[PDB]
Amino acid sequence: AVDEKLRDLYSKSTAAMSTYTGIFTDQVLSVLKGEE
């Protein structure tokens, strides 16, 4: 088992959580019921 540290930088945000892969949240995700 090699999980001591293995760099924490690459292991903390790149996970792609909070649906934050590129940059789309709120607003862009709330305009479908504006007239459709």
Angstrom CA distances, 30 to 5, 12, 17, 22, stand at: 40, 28, 19, 17
Distance, CA of 11 to CA of 36 (rounded, Å): 40
Q: From which experimental method does this structure derive? A: NMR
DSSP letter (8 states) at residue 18: T
Query: What is the distance of C-alpha 35 from the center of its chain?
Result: 28
